Amino acid sequence: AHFKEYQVIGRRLPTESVPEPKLFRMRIFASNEVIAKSRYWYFLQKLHKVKKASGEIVSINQINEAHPTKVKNFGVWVRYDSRSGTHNMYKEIRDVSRVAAVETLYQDMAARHRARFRSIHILKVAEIEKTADVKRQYVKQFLTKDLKFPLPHRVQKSTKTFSYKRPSTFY
């Protein structure tokens, strides 16, 4: 859906042999708290020997964007499962916030590789603080000095089923 980012902090259940476990923390892009906690336990079952019955979640907090009106370039490292194997990819997206960047990332992977939400693993997402570290041409195209371009062929959708003059596509 429209994604939100949460921090989820959890731990193992405390025993007498070891009280105070190590309080692992992860950042999850998810639609809501339930999906966020499910993905948290999914990745902790991939990492450490723990499961939901043997552990607990001590905190979940929404992390909204610090500057939601700054235009950033993000580099995203992703695992995905194809029909024959597992691959790593690095894609970079020029967008205004992290949740919108990963939303366009999920759309991009589903469009160009037919990869689903169950197949995509988000390794990391990070803002590229400096230009000329941008490595893709499709985003390096929009970083030029005095960028301007026209929008040819305007199509205006009509409300009536009949129009009384030939329309114009000037913009």
Binding site: T69, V71, R94, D95, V96, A100, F142, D146, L147, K148, F149, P150, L151, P152, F170, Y171
Partner: protein, 67 residues
């Protein structure tokens, strides 16, 4: 004689271009394009008309001849 072309200029999108919000919650106010996200969407701001600073798809605004 001299060479003649038909120029055919139209309404470039760049910073400082004044746009009119076509549909949405503003829906009829003016804004100024602050920056260009990509080919299809831009970051605008309309601070006199009460339009909050936001990223918006270019299909939801109409570009005006004002710069």
């Amino acid at each position: 004689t001299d060479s003649i072309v038909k120029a055919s200029n139209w309404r470039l999108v760049e910073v400082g271009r004044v746009v009119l919000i076509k549909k949405g919650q503003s829906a009829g106010k003016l804004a100024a394009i602050v920056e260009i996200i990509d080919q299809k969407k831009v970051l605008i701001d309309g601070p006199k008309a009460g339009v909050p600073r936001q990223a918006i798809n270019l299909g939801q605004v109409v570009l005006t001849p004002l710069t």
